[PDB]
Protein backbone atom coordinates (compact mmCIF):
# COMPACT_ATOMS: atom_id res chain seq x y z
CA UNK A 1 0.00 0.00 0.00
CA UNK A 2 0.97 3.61 -0.58
CA UNK A 3 0.03 7.27 -0.63
CA UNK A 4 -1.31 8.25 2.80
CA UNK A 5 0.10 11.68 3.81
CA UNK A 6 0.00 14.23 6.60
CA UNK A 7 -2.30 16.38 4.39
CA UNK A 8 -4.81 13.45 4.22
CA UNK A 9 -4.69 12.90 7.97
CA UNK A 10 -5.41 16.60 8.53
CA UNK A 11 -8.39 16.45 6.16
CA UNK A 12 -10.00 13.58 8.14
CA UNK A 13 -12.31 14.68 10.89
CA UNK A 14 -14.24 13.24 13.81
CA UNK A 15 -17.76 11.94 13.07
CA UNK A 16 -16.90 11.20 9.50
CA UNK A 17 -18.38 7.86 8.30
CA UNK A 18 -16.04 4.94 7.78
CA UNK A 19 -16.74 5.12 4.03
CA UNK A 20 -15.77 8.82 3.83
CA UNK A 21 -12.62 8.33 5.91
CA UNK A 22 -11.71 5.45 3.63
CA UNK A 23 -12.19 7.46 0.48
CA UNK A 24 -10.26 10.53 1.68
CA UNK A 25 -7.46 8.35 3.05
CA UNK A 26 -7.00 6.76 -0.38
CA UNK A 27 -9.16 3.61 -0.07
CA UNK A 28 -7.69 0.29 -1.20
CA UNK A 29 -4.63 1.86 -2.73
CA UNK A 30 -3.46 3.23 0.66
CA UNK A 31 -5.42 1.41 3.36
CA UNK A 32 -6.23 -1.86 5.00
CA UNK A 33 -9.50 -2.38 6.90
CA UNK A 34 -8.51 -4.49 9.97
CA UNK A 35 -12.17 -4.19 11.34
CA UNK A 36 -11.08 -3.01 14.77
CA UNK A 37 -9.29 -0.11 12.94
CA UNK A 38 -8.29 1.14 9.45
CA UNK A 39 -4.55 1.38 8.79
CA UNK A 40 -3.40 3.67 6.02
CA UNK A 41 0.24 3.69 4.82
CA UNK A 42 2.44 6.39 3.43
CA UNK A 43 4.41 4.01 1.26
CA UNK A 44 4.99 0.21 0.71
CA UNK A 45 7.20 0.06 3.80
CA UNK A 46 4.50 -0.85 6.21
CA UNK A 47 6.81 0.00 9.12
CA UNK A 48 6.84 3.58 7.63
CA UNK A 49 4.62 6.50 8.40
CA UNK A 50 0.94 5.57 8.80
CA UNK A 51 -2.36 6.74 10.23
CA UNK A 52 -4.84 4.58 12.09
CA UNK A 53 -8.53 5.31 12.42
CA UNK A 54 -11.15 3.91 14.75
CA UNK A 55 -14.89 4.05 14.76
CA UNK A 56 -17.79 3.96 17.18
CA UNK A 57 -20.59 1.37 16.93
CA UNK A 58 -22.28 3.59 14.42
CA UNK A 59 -19.18 3.50 12.14
CA UNK A 60 -18.37 7.27 12.72
CA UNK A 61 -14.77 8.34 13.41
CA UNK A 62 -13.93 8.77 17.04
CA UNK A 63 -10.11 8.13 17.14
CA UNK A 64 -7.05 9.22 15.09
CA UNK A 65 -3.57 7.71 15.71
CA UNK A 66 -0.39 8.48 13.75
CA UNK A 67 3.13 7.11 13.75
CA UNK A 68 5.80 9.27 11.97
CA UNK A 69 3.45 11.47 10.08
CA UNK A 70 4.18 14.18 12.67
CA UNK A 71 7.16 13.10 14.61
CA UNK A 72 8.48 14.92 17.76
CA UNK A 73 10.68 17.56 16.10
CA UNK A 74 13.37 17.76 18.80
CA UNK A 75 13.51 14.49 20.79
CA UNK A 76 15.30 15.13 24.06
CA UNK A 77 13.25 13.16 26.61
CA UNK A 78 15.24 12.09 29.72
CA UNK A 79 14.36 10.35 32.92
CA UNK A 80 14.74 13.47 35.11
CA UNK A 81 12.14 15.13 32.86
CA UNK A 82 9.79 12.11 33.15
CA UNK A 83 10.20 12.36 36.96
CA UNK A 84 8.85 15.96 36.98
CA UNK A 85 5.41 14.69 35.91
CA UNK A 86 2.59 13.29 38.01
CA UNK A 87 -0.94 12.17 37.31
CA UNK A 88 -3.47 14.96 38.06
CA UNK A 89 -1.48 17.67 36.25
CA UNK A 90 -3.25 19.86 33.78
CA UNK A 91 -1.87 20.01 30.23
CA UNK A 92 -0.37 23.45 31.07
CA UNK A 93 1.42 22.16 34.11
CA UNK A 94 2.68 19.23 32.03
CA UNK A 95 4.02 21.36 29.18
CA UNK A 96 5.90 23.50 31.72
CA UNK A 97 7.72 20.34 32.81
CA UNK A 98 8.10 18.69 29.41
CA UNK A 99 9.11 20.52 26.24
CA UNK A 100 6.42 20.21 23.56
CA UNK A 101 9.02 19.67 20.88
CA UNK A 102 10.07 16.38 22.49
CA UNK A 103 6.65 14.79 22.17
CA UNK A 104 4.57 13.50 19.26
CA UNK A 105 0.80 13.81 19.30
CA UNK A 106 0.23 10.09 19.05
CA UNK A 107 -3.57 9.98 19.26
CA UNK A 108 -6.72 12.00 19.84
CA UNK A 109 -10.00 10.41 20.79
CA UNK A 110 -13.56 11.62 21.27
CA UNK A 111 -15.29 8.35 22.26
CA UNK A 112 -18.64 10.04 22.72
CA UNK A 113 -18.66 12.10 19.49
CA UNK A 114 -20.64 14.12 18.70
CA UNK A 115 -20.35 14.94 22.41
CA UNK A 116 -16.80 16.10 23.26
CA UNK A 117 -16.36 14.82 26.86
CA UNK A 118 -14.06 11.85 27.73
CA UNK A 119 -11.50 13.25 25.24
CA UNK A 120 -8.33 11.27 25.37
CA UNK A 121 -5.16 12.86 24.17
CA UNK A 122 -2.02 10.72 24.00
CA UNK A 123 1.63 11.68 23.66
CA UNK A 124 4.79 9.68 23.01
CA UNK A 125 8.03 11.55 23.94
CA UNK A 126 11.20 9.93 22.59
CA UNK A 127 14.74 10.46 23.75
CA UNK A 128 16.31 10.55 20.30
CA UNK A 129 15.19 10.69 16.66
CA UNK A 130 16.06 7.03 15.63
CA UNK A 131 13.18 4.64 15.25
CA UNK A 132 12.17 2.87 18.44
CA UNK A 133 14.13 5.15 20.72
CA UNK A 134 13.31 4.87 24.41
CA UNK A 135 10.26 7.01 25.17
CA UNK A 136 7.78 8.19 27.77
CA UNK A 137 4.00 7.73 27.17
CA UNK A 138 1.28 10.09 28.54
CA UNK A 139 -2.52 10.13 28.39
CA UNK A 140 -4.74 13.11 29.26
CA UNK A 141 -8.44 12.48 29.96
CA UNK A 142 -10.27 15.82 29.43
CA UNK A 143 -7.06 17.81 29.95
CA UNK A 144 -5.83 16.06 33.15
CA UNK A 145 -2.90 13.57 33.14
CA UNK A 146 -4.36 10.18 33.96
CA UNK A 147 -1.63 7.76 32.67
CA UNK A 148 2.23 8.06 32.59
CA UNK A 149 4.92 5.45 31.87
CA UNK A 150 8.36 5.08 30.42
CA UNK A 151 11.01 2.56 29.64
CA UNK A 152 14.76 2.90 29.26
CA UNK A 153 14.96 6.69 29.31
CA UNK A 154 17.44 8.50 29.22
From TrEMBL:
Disulfide links within the chain: 31-40, 103-125
Record keywords: Signal
Coiled-coil intervals: none
Keyword Signal among UniProt keywords: yes
Membrane-crossing segments per the record: none
UniProt protein name: Beta-Lactamase Inhibitory Protein-Like Protein
Organism: Streptomyces clavuligerus
Lineage: Bacteria, Bacillati, Actinomycetota, Actinomycetes, Kitasatosporales
Parent-protein start and end of this portion: 29 to 182 of 182
Amino acid sequence: YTGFTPERYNKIQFGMDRTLVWQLAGADQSCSDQVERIICYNNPDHYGPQGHFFFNAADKLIHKRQMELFPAPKPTMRLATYNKTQTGMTEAQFWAAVPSDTCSALAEQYPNWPATNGNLREYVCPSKAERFAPSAYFTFTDGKLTSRSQSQLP
